[PDB]
Amino acid sequence: GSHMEKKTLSLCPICLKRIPATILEEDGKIIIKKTCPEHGEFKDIYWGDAELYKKFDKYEFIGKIEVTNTKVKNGCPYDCGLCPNHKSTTILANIDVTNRCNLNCPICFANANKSGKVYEPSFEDIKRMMENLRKEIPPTPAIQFAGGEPTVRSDLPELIKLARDMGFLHVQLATNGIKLKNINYLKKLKEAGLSTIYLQFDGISEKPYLVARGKNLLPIKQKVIENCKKVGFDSVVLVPTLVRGVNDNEVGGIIRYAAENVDVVRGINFQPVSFTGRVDEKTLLEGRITIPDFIKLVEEQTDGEITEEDFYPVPSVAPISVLVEKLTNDRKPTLSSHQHCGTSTYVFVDEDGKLIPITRFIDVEGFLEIVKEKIEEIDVKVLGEIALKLPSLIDLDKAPKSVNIKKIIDLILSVLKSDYSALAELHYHMLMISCMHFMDAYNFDVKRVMRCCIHYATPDDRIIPFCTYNTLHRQEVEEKFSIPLEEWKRMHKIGGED
Numbered sequence: 001g002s003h004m005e006k007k008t009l010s011l012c013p014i015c016l017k018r019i020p021a022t023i024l025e026e027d028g029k030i031i032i033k034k035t036c037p038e039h040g041e042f043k044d045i046y047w048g049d050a051e052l053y054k055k056f057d058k059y060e061f062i063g064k065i066e067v068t069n070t071k072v073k074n075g076c077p078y079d080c081g082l083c084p085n086h087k088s089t090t091i092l093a094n095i096d097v098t099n100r101c102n103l104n105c106p107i108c109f110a111n112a113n114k115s116g117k118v119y120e121p122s123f124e125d126i127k128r129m130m131e132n133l134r135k136e137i138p139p140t141p142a143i144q145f146a147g148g149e150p151t152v153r154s155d156l157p158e159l160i161k162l163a164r165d166m167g168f169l170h171v172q173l174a175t176n177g178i179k180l181k182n183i184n185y186l187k188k189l190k191e192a193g194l195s196t197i198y199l200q201f202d203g204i205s206e207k208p209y210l211v212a213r214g215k216n217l218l219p220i221k222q223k224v225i226e227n228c229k230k231v232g233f234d235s236v237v238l239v240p241t242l243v244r245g246v247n248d249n250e251v252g253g254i255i256r257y258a259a260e261n262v263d264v265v266r267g268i269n270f271q272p273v274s275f276t277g278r279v280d281e282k283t284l285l286e287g288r289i290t291i292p293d294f295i296k297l298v299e300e301q302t303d304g305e306i307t308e309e310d311f312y313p314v315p316s317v318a319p320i321s322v323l324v325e326k327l328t329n330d331r332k333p334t335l336s337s338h339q340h341c342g343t344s345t346y347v348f349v350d351e352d353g354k355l356i357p358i359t360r361f362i363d364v365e366g367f368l369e370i371v372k373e374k375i376e377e378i379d380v381k382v383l384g385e386i387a388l389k390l391p392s393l394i395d396l397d398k399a400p401k402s403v404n405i406k407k408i409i410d411l412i413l414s415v416l417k418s419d420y421s422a423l424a425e426l427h428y429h430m431l432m433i434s435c436m437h438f439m440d441a442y443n444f445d446v447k448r449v450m451r452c453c454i455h456y457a458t459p460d461d462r463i464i465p466f467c468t469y470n471t472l473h474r475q476e477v478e479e480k481f482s483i484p485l486e487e488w489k490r491m492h493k494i495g496g497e498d
C-alpha cells in the first residue's frame with residue numbers, strides 16, 4: 001500500500017501549531033499526513049506524481065547563510081528571520097509597498113482590502129529595508145515591489161529608481177496591470193528603470209478572470225501587452241494563479257499566447273493556488289493542483305512539444321553559482337531552494353511557432369554533471385575544458401533552424417565567466433516556463449521552508465521567507481505598522497501623498 005518517503009514537521013491548519021508529519025507514497029501520489037494533539041488527523045496532497053517526486057530528490061542542494069537578523073527562540077518556522085538555521089540567502093526580495101489595492105479579488109493570498117487599516121511604509125522605511133537586504137553575504141541581487149497593488153502609490157517610480165540606486169541587478173513589479181493600461185504611466189516605469197513586469201494573468205478567456213478576480217480583466221491584460229509593444233518594454237512575465245477546475249484547461253493556451261508575444265513576454269510563472277489569505281470555499285475544496293500535475297498539463301496541452309523530461313527543479317542550477325564563485329573568488333547568489341518548491345524549463349519559439357525546449361537539444365543533465373565535477377577539481381584550465389566538452393552535449397539534429405547554436409554556447413560560457421549581461425541576453429532569446437507552489441497550512445513542510453530563497457523585508461528589520469510570511473507573519477506585521485483607514489484617508493490623498 002503506502003510507503004514512507006520522509007518525516008518532517010508541518011502546521012495544524014486550525015491552530016497553526018508546529019506538528020509532526022509523514023510524507024508517504026500512496027497510489028502513485030505523494031501525500032502528507034499529520035496529527036495535531038488538539039485537532040487530530042489531517043491528510044493532504046503533497047505532490048501529484050510519486051515518480052517525478054523521487055526524480056527531483058537528486059537535485060537537493062543545501063546552501064549556507066552568514067548574515068542573520070533574528071536568534072533561535074522557538075525553533076522553525078517561528079523564528080523568522082533570518083535565524084541562524086536558515087539555509088539560503090535572499091535571491092529575490094519582496095517589499096510590500098502597500099496593502100491598498102484597486103481590485104478586490106476572490107483569490108488573494110494577501111487578503112488585501114479587508115483589515116480596514118492601511119499599511120504603507122515611507123520612502124525612508126523602504127530604503128532601510130533595502131539596506132538590510134543588501135547587507136547579506138552575498139548581497140540580495142533582486143527585489144520585487146508587491147502588496148497590495150504597488151501602482152496605487154504615486155511614488156512607485158521613485159521607489160524603482162531607489163532600488164536601482166541601492167545596487168539591485170533586477171527590479172521587478174508584481175502588478176495586476178490595471179494602471180498600466182495607460183501608456184504614459186507605463187512610460188514612467190520604463191524610464192525609472194524597471195527590469196520586469198510580473199503581470200497577474202489568469203487565462204486566455206474571460207472565465208478564469210471572473211472566478212479569480214471578479215471581473216473580465218482579459219481586455220485590460222491584452223492592452224498592457226500591446227502597450228509594452230508600443231513603448232518597447234520587452235520583459236513581461238505572465239503569472240497565472242492555477243486552480244483546478246478554472247484554468248487548468250488553459251495551460252497550453254497561456255503558453256501559446258506568450259509564445260505569440262515572445263517579443264515582450266519573457267516567461268510564464270504558474271502559481272498553483274495557495275490556500276493562504278483570501279480563498280473562496282469551492283477553490284479551497286476542489287482547486288488543489290501540484291507541480292507534477294502542472295507538468296502533465298503542459299505536456300498534454302502543447303501536444304508533446306514540451307515533455308516531462310524538459311523540466312528541472314530550481315536547485316539544479318545551484319552548482320552553476322558555486323562554480324562561478326570558485327572561478328572568480330566572488331560570492332555569488334545561489335539558487336539553493338528545496339527541490340520540491342518549483343520547476344522550470346526554457347523554450348525557443350521557431351518560425352512555425354513550435355516550442356523547442358533547450359533541453360531537447362542540449363544535454364542539460366550532462367552539463368550539470370560536468371559543472372559538479374569541475375567544482376570537485378577546484379583554476380585557469382576549467383573553463384577551457386568545459387568549453388571543449390560542450391559540443392558533445394549538443395544534438396544539432398534537434399536544434400531549431402532559427403537558432404545560432406554557436407551563439408548560445410558562447411552565452412552559456414559567458415555565464416560561467418559571471419557575465420550577467422549574457423544571462424539576460426540568454427533570457428531574451430527564450431521563453432521561460434516555470435511553476436512555483438507556495439505552501440499553505442495544509443501542505444506546509446518545514447524542510448522546504450528552511451531553504452526558501454524568496455523573502456520579505458519587513459519594517460521591523462526582519463527578512464522573512466515568503467511561505468512563512470503569508471501563513472504566519474503577515475497579519476502581525478501589517479497590524480503593527482498600519483493606521484486605521486478612516487484616519488489615513490483624512491491625512492493623505494489617493495496616491496498616498498500627504
Ligand SMILES: CCCCCCCCCCCCCCCC(=O)OC[C@H](COP(=O)(O)O)OC(=O)CCCCCCCCCCCCCCC
Pocket residue numbers: 092094146147169170174194195196235236237266267269310311312313314316317343344345346358359364423424425427428432436454
Ligand atoms: C508577490 C510575490 C510573488 C513572488 C513570486 C516569485 C517569482 C519568481 C521569479 C520568476 C522568474 C522571473 C525571471 C525574469 C525573467 C526575465 O525577464 O529575464 C530577462 C531579464 C533581463 O532584463 P533586464 O536586462 O531589463 O534586467 O534577465 C533576468 O531577469 C535574469 C535573471 C534570470 C533568473 C533565472 C532563474 C532560474 C530558474 C531555475 C531554472 C531551472 C533549470 C531550467 C532547465 C531548463
Ligand SMILES: C[C@H]1O[C@@H](n2cnc3c(N)ncnc32)[C@H](O)[C@@H]1O
Pocket residue numbers: 107108109110174199200201239240241242271272273274275276277
Ligand atoms: C503575485 C501573484 O500572485 C497571484 N496570487 C494571488 N493569490 C494567490 C494564491 N492564493 N495562490 C497563488 N497565487 C496567487 C496574484 O494573482 C499575482 O499574479
Ligand code: MET
Pocket residue numbers: 101108109110146147148149150174175176177198199200
Ligand atoms: C497578492 S497579489 C500582489 C501583487 C498584485 N496585486 C497582483 O495581483 O499581481
Ligand code: SF4
Pocket residue numbers: 075076077078079080081082083084085086087449450465468
Ligand atoms: S524558515 Fe528559516 S528564518 Fe524562519 S525559523 Fe525556519 S530556519 Fe529560521
Ligand code: SF4
Pocket residue numbers: 101102103104105107108109110111112147148149176
Ligand atoms: S491578488 Fe493582487 S490585485 Fe487581487 S486583490 Fe490581492 S493584492 Fe489586489
Ligand code: SF4
Pocket residue numbers: 337338341342436437438439448449451452453454465466467
Ligand atoms: S517561497 Fe515558498 S515555495 Fe518558494 S522557495 Fe520559499 S518556501 Fe519554497
Ligand SMILES: [Fe+3]
Pocket residue numbers: 012013014015016017036037038039040
Ligand atoms: Fe491544531
